[PDB]
Amino acid sequence: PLTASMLASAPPQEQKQMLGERLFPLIQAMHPTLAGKITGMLLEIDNSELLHMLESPESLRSKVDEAVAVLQAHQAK
């Protein structure tokens, strides 16, 4: 598992990518086509919360559901 220590010791420019690599397969399971876009949207959240989302399925799902609701409304209009 990815840990806070691992993230904090990574160069800042790799941190989002490291989180993204672990979040993407989970988000893709939920949304096989929107996964790339939803992952990108979620990666704007701060790193502490992203790590929490990685560790807490209910937390990840709540953020994914909000991003999807907004994205799909955007696509529709």
Binding site: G36, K37, L43, K63, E66
Partner: peptide, 15 residues
Amino acid sequence: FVPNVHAAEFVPSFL
């Protein structure tokens, strides 16, 4: 968390 529809897509490219 206010979702940003302009956010860059995360492209899987990790191998």
